[PDB]
Symmetry: C3
Subunit: 228 residues, 3 copies
């Protein structure tokens, strides 16, 4: 499978590896939702999402997006932004182990966790405008939730690439570690966050995100308009 | 036994220094003394106002015993008066400088974020610790944090009870300036004397345009204090 | 003598340079010359647009003589035309690069905040000095400031007339890149050429999604300009 799920009495860990660049297509999206389903059933104290040794995620399957029937593309875009909503509204602390580059939907997923760890050399970019695509509204709201006002303008309108210290200052990540310890740090942070009071964490995080979550929902409902 | 606030002033600034001999808890006595000191600064028509803590802390926040035990009315009245003070400082017609002379925890941090310019030292921990101790951050406090913190720091400070100090507190938007611990107070007074040179009328008008929506949301949070306890 | 604005272009970018021989006040002449220069860039359909100041400033802001004395109409018309320029640049369908070639004060700073990418040098003061000289920042300008500054920088820039320079201006959101003074303009041109390589239709659509709410509020501030004078 393209997703591995492991857990203990404290945390759950969901690791993406399709042997390539972790495209968020239907297979990968289904595997992720099934993994989060398990962590829901297992009632983990916190949850880690990690990529592979090559990338965090290169984003949506560009073949689906650029050719063929609109319905597969619509469903891929919807399921991807629904995952973001699911993570941004997750009742447990969510830690992202950005184990490689995070591009476009990979970057929006990166911005869907409570704490995000990457290494200095990992490029983070919403490259839509550079490849001829308009960033969907649901994606804009996720970016607006995390980036500084000025980084938001450059990331979206200019397809700007961030890495390490500039990604940290921009609000794309929360912590920098060495590449070989990105995952262990994320697991370690997840354990710390599992020690927070779960009920107060969920109530407070939803207070910090309620308006953004509603706008993300309207963006998901309006996905068809993004195709015309 | 004497009051927990010292007020001094000259022809330019007023200085309000909290010291209850402990951690400057923001209980009924401290709130009353603070409001009385600000009343004095209003009457004296100071050009700017400094709020400072003591040797140990800026403020450790509300009295946790009142919050976790007993009748809701003492708890409700304490939270309301605390967030009312934040409203008062955030809408003060003169520039307000915070001399963060120690750690600022929970309501200590929300008060910290209620002044126009905030000076702290490298080792002073700044944290809204509510989530770590089983409390949901009130709406009035959420609005204060959102007014000043960067988007990502707001998320971590509130949802993860993250602790900030010095350069990371500066980067987060919890403070505006770092000084050595022994010059935090003199630096804050210096800034206050500079800010008193601003045009007061334009300062008040402009700061209120910069805060109108947040203040209204802070007012709504103060009115809904009962909802934070379950009515 | 000459006009206060120079417009030149090639097949990729256009460059607009402000130089009234002083501090580039955004009075009626400069504003008209600016709008005419942007009109030319529109006709030429440039891929990206550079706005630059002179060797002394980016711009010192509005004409204070117009603002502080005489009939209200010249002042109102000046304020409106200045914020209309910010609206025009913030909603420009091409990438706009600001070559901040000197200090940028008050409306100069608000204009600086109207481009997509902002290049300055370390020594250049960026400041909305309104409160220090007795003026309330108009609503339209606050919306421009709020679009770009971090929440805390916003509070200090507006309420405290805080001055920003280099790394502090960069961290605040007043600029996006720092260059040595003699390369501010050429670096801005280089960046503008890169940005012309973006997909124009996606850049315009995406930037308007990032700004729609602020632009609506800037329009309301422009409609309410008379209320700023009473």
């Amino acid at each position: 499978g393209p997703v591995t799920y492991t857990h203990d009495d404290a945390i759950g860990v969901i690791r993406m590896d399709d042997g390539k660049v972790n495209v968020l297509g239907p297979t990968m999206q289904q595997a992720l939702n099934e993994a989060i389903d398990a962590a829901d059933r297992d009632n983990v104290g916190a949850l880690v999402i990690a990529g592979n040794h090559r990338v965090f995620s290169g984003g949506f399957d560009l073949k689906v997006l650029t050719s063929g029937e609109a319905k597969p593309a619509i469903d891929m875009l919807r399921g991807g932004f629904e995952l973001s909503y699911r993570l941004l509204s997750y009742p447990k602390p969510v830690v992202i182990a950005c184990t490689g580059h995070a591009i476009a939907m990979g970057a929006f997923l990166l911005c869907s966790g409570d704490h995000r760890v990457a290494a200095h050399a990992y490029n983070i970019q919403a490259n839509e405008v550079a490849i001829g695509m308009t960033i969907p509204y649901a994606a804009m709201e996720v970016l607006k939730l995390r980036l500084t006002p000025s980084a938001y303008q450059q990331a979206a309108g200019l397809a700007k690439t961030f890495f390490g210290e500039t990604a940290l200052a921009a609000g794309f990540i929360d912590e920098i570690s060495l590449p070989e310890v990105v995952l262990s740090r994320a697991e370690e942070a997840a354990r710390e966050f599992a020690g927070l009071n779960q009920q107060a964490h969920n109530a407070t995080k939803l207070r910090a995100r309620a308006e953004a979550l509603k706008a993300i929902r309207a963006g998901i409902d309006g996905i068809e308009a993004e195709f015309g």
